[PDB]
Amino acid sequence: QTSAVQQKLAALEKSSGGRLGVALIDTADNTQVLYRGDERFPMCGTSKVMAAAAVLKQSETQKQLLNQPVEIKPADLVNYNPIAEKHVNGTMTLAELSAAALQYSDNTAMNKLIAQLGGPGGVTAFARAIGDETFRLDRTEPTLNTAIPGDPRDTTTPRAMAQTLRQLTLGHALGETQRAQLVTWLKGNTTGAASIRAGLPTSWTVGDKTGSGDYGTTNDIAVIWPQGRAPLVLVTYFTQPQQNAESRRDVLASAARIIAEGL
Known part of the structure; x- marks a missing residue:
């Protein structure tokens, strides 16, 4: 059996040509709405939340870690480096790398976070x-x-990433300062204006991280504070049949927009 919400999401998917994955967690009473919730999707840059969070976790015992400068060499630049290119033969701190990765989708910044964690396996660990028993990071930028x-x-999966985003931003997977810092970074994202945010009431406060990749892969994961109600977590993953989509x-x-109805 399916609900009207899932039926609407299926109709959207059908019109879209692609494969849509959705997970909503309503923290008022811990209910969930899933659409292909347990299917795997390419994360693309939504994985940057896990990498930044891992560094935040490290800083709970190394409390000056976010202040540590990291060198940026010409050889470090990859395919999309809006902030890192300003610091070639210079440095960015781990805080600055986190902000750039999350708020500007900077791929060089993500590679520095991955390196700080000892490689993609460090992010997975x-x-x-x-x-999170589902997440896997295998590669660096840009091949991920x-x-x-x-x-x-x-x-x-959408379900796993929703649970993780909930634990990181609303729960206590991170320390108190670190949780607030992650929320601050997600709220100030610059790349999300046409994604989940565009489908929600404008009075609602949103933190999000988008993802983009080949096969027209278009992603967004968000923590949401609706008007007068308990917060929500929403993951929307979308990928298409054509490499060049x-x-x-x-x-x-x-x-x-569908998910927000009634909330």
Whole structure:
């Protein structure tokens, strides 16, 4: 059996040409709405939340860690480096790298976070340590966004990523300062205006991280504070059959619009 919410999401998927994954957690009474909730999707840059969070976790015992400068060499630059390119032969702190990765989708910044954790496996080990049994990071930037159909590398499920985002931002997977810092970074994101945020009431406060990759992969994960009610977590993953497909942020906005009904 399916609910009207799931039926609407299925109709959206049908019109879209692609494969849509949605997970909503309503923290008022811990209810969930899932659509392909246990299917794997390429995370693309939504994985940057796990990498930044892992570094935040490290800073709970190394309390000056976020202040540590990291060198940026010309050789470090990859395919999308809006902030890191300002610091070639210079430095960015781990805080600055986190902000750039999360708020500007900077891929060089993500590679520095991955390196700080000892490689993609270090990010995965953090995921396991906070109870995410589904997340896997296998590669660095930019290849972690290849989003090849059937490829299990650099994937997770909408249900798992929603649970993790809830634990990181509303729960206590992180220390108190670290949780607040992650929320601050997500709230100030610059890349999300056409995605989940575009489908929600404008009075609602939103923190999000988008994802983009090949096969027209278009993602967004958000923590949401609706008007006068307990917060929500929403994951919207979308990927398409054609390697060269264009982005479809409108599909994420439409999914958010459906999900917001009644909340």
